[PDB]
């Protein structure tokens, strides 16, 4: 039964991979099924690339169609169909399974005690959208996102596994459209809810990191550059060669120098054509950052066009445009004169709070406490005979 | 038997679904929880049983002490099939439940099905040992899960709890073969048992 199937897997495979097929069979005899589930996991962790991976699934799913937990089972298929080079085949298998899960739930309910079963279904619809996108159908995936999003919100919560796959599809779609802004939001969440599995290869995580850095260079209101380098995702890959000059564009932006930025960008614009098509956004971005920064670290509320023009290396003609985009983006608030040529700031954007700034907050509160306590002492002496 | 208050503890670990008992161990348990409730009542009808889970990843009080199986049934069907048994929490929770009752002249018992090996701290086990001896609570554990690859940490403590006393605490070990789970509990003493007095 399982015996005939087991022989057939071993033969077409390599000698190195015979004991893997053997571990499963052993758990089956003893009937320890906690161990059988774990041992499938070791398989799909690092041998989802073997040609037999899909068939191996086909015997186990039939047995544990309604016996063990639905999240467990489904998980194997998804990993198997991430390793197929033929996506027409991938779409067919999902479409059958999708169909089985709609029948299954009738049966399955009585076995568990009472449980959900929409868990497998949500993951299947994501895989249909991802197959479409690797084949370049933006629209078919597009109506699948809408319908899939609403079902997340219908529940009080979605699991971390389920929501990674939903956010998996969103990342793929956005980088084709070439919206940096959209790509950025999906990646920061993906790291938060990121699966604890080693089943998600590090190769994907690296690739995802490169694209993330690119979103924030071309971005439109992202002043989270320091923040990006704190999280493990970028911190550890600083000493890799192709992600050197890439992080140096982060660091040049921070300190607000124009020369380190100039020397870098002239090389990488030529080398990589991604920086070429979004050139218009890239130059402006520095200018905006310089402006905000000079405003934030100081405590005064106005600057002449003369101070601004030296800082940003722009003439006073372009400076008035620079100011208009900053107010519009939501970085600053204020008003503009051209008759005294001031920018009057009235609002600054709360940014990363450093240890030093906490001390600073505190000093002022002590100043205000004393003032209140003093006034309240006088206000007792006054009105002493007239109170309730 | 005598008028007895029992907390039945159900394990909802991910070894509670092993194929050892037909059809699945989880379906085997539905039949045993029902079976056991009934055995106790038919012995002497002044028995009551409450329901708590020791697993689901969280322990949960479903049911306090009741003479209706309809509530105990209702608590059982609401379960989440994955967990891990937290041995320590079940004993404590069970003990507090036993302090408050509708009759406070009843024997104090905890019966727990254990479907997995324990992952609990050693120190933690030693503290509960003397907590059961302070409050004069006796416990029969039905084990068919902690003998599959584990050795009984629990043995010494369960022994210690026994005193001359109309209740006898016992470790009950079940061969985990096919003959169904309610049947092995029935053929184990649990209402065929004698006292220590």
From Swiss-Prot, chain A:
* Residue span, PCI domain: 182-350
Which SMART domains is this protein grouped with?
PINT
- Top-rank taxon: Eukaryota
From the UniProt record, report the name of the gene that encodes this protein. Answer: RPN9
Provide the Gene Ontology terms for cellular component. cytosol; nucleus; proteasome complex; proteasome regulatory particle, lid subcomplex; proteasome storage granule
* Name of the protein this chain belongs to: 26S proteasome regulatory subunit RPN9
Enumerate the InterPro entries for this protein. PCI_dom, PSD13_N, PSMD13, Rpn9_C, WH_DNA-bd_sf
Q: Name one GO molecular function term.
A: structural molecule activity
From Swiss-Prot, chain B:
- Protein's name in the database: 26S proteasome regulatory subunit RPN10
GO molecular-function terms, A-Z: K48-linked polyubiquitin modification-dependent protein binding; polyubiquitin modification-dependent protein binding
VWFA domain mapped to chain residues: 5-190
PTM info = Ubiquitinated, leading to its degradation. Ubiquitination is promoted by HUL5.
Gene inactivation phenotype reads:
Cells are viable.
What does the record note on quaternary structure? Answer: The 26S proteasome is composed of a core protease, known as the 20S proteasome, capped at one or both ends by the 19S regulatory complex (RC). The RC is composed of at least 18 different subunits in two subcomplexes, the base and the lid, which form the portions proximal and distal to the 20S proteolytic core, respectively.
Q: Which GO terms describe its cellular component?
A: cytosol; nucleus; proteasome complex; proteasome regulatory particle, base subcomplex
For this UniProt record, the keywords arranged alphabetically read as follows: Proteasome, Ubl conjugation
GO BP, sorted A to Z:
proteasome assembly; proteasome-mediated ubiquitin-dependent protein catabolic process; ubiquitin-dependent protein catabolic process
Role noted for this protein: Multiubiquitin binding protein.
Family per record: Belongs to the proteasome subunit S5A family.
Organism ancestry: Eukaryota, Fungi, Dikarya, Ascomycota, Saccharomycotina
Tell me the part of the parent protein that is shown. 1 to 197 of 268
Q: What else is known?
A: Present with 17200 molecules/cell in log phase SD medium.
